[model samples]
Target: SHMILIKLGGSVITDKSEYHKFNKETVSRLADEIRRSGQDVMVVHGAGSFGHVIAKKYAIQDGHVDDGQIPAAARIMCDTRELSSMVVEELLAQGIPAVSVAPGSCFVMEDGKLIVDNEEPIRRLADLGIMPVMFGDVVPDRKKGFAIVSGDQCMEVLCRMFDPEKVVFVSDIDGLYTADPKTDKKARLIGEVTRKMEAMLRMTDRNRRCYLVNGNAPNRLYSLLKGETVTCTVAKGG
Candidate 1:
């Protein structure tokens, strides 16, 4: 199966500055693109405003230290699930057989390593041509008690499971840049990034086909899926 693992980046899907603000229009458009692509696809989305804001306040990523953070962890899980539900709803509306597979519920951290409680169900879903949509969420960690498992982390792990031909990250900005383009005026988009810049994006797996494209750009995702060269950044893994 020509599965395409697409990660809907948090920055593109939600207004992170605002709490729980979802970019419905963007997600809806992306959903259409996925449907239009006509490829076996699995979606992994970031927490964005749904979890990042609250996680930071409680320092959830750093892990549990005090009992006071318990409620905050639950709250973070609740909000991300809400966001995931919205995403799955949109995908279903677009005729994509998408179901939400939560990271918190299925994935756990043992000594900071992610362990999937069960991979069979996810594999079965993909095999049946049903898209399983997963999102970053709060997961139990043996070393830290609880940890913030990011979509990127999930993407990397799942890539090993499905080994999708293409792994794309849909971001708000154009693509990978020399610097944070939003704040740095001189930031230039690197058309083709190699392992040298791998540290910049923190993307591992140099042997895989990974891309960064602007989800905000109408038809860019569609074009990329159609195998057309578009205005985007390509990470040429060595």
Candidate 2:
């Protein structure tokens, strides 16, 4: 088994309401949880307020990079690295041996498709018992001069190569509720999902096996990885 792929929701780690702010307590605890897992895992994360806000400010996604947009692109790059570096620092502080590889530095896009995974270095790191961390980044593209790739997009590309046995989506709430559990107090939480459901939901081509768990709670990840019963939205293939 390739074990598991972990995606840290930006909404959970960063203060979506605030500008470029991260919830340190939540991320610090999450790092501790993941480090205690003592299993092989790859990590990806959302840009949340970090990348989205600046990208919108500069129109980085328009793919029309001119001299004027260079500053915006540069700022996006800096902000994203700041976030990724924080995650990596926390992981390393926990003695997790985490190495972050920016997608733009390793991967490529041709005709709107990611043609390079740059997994050779990634696989090598894993072979040596090191964890590889990838995140949403600003990258040069063939179809569109430059673009911002989401952590989800990076996960999609990785799944094709890693064939991970499972995925964990860390959220602030309890999995995918039938309704917004916050306001509706009576909202039902949807538990398990498979390819048939995935097809209905149009997830046939993305990360096939996935799960959503609370990233805010302590040790939830360690528990989830240990196969303990916990509140989560599980997605799998037939």
TM-scores, in order shown? 0.93, 0.86
Q: Locate the minimum summed-lDDT window of 10 residues in model 1.
A: 195-204
- Checking candidate 1 for backbone clashes, the offending pairs are none
lDDT of 1 by residue, 1-238 (tens): 4777899988889998999999999999999998898877789999999999999898887888999899999999999999999999889999988788888887788765678868899889877867788888999997888987888878878877777777888888888788988899999888877642353244435555678889999999999988899988887544
Task: Please write out the lDDT profile of model 2 over residues 74-160, one tens digit for every residue.
Answer: 777777788888888888888888888788777777765666744688888777877788888888887777877877767767666
| Ten contiguous residues minimizing lDDT sum, candidate 2 | 195-204
Cα RMSDs of all predictions?
A: 2.2, 3.4
Best by lDDT: 1
Instruction: Tell me the spans in candidate 1 whose CA falls farther than 4 Å from its real position.
Output: 196-208
What is the TM-score of candidate 1?
Answer: 0.93
Q: Which pairs in model 2 have colliding backbones?
A: none
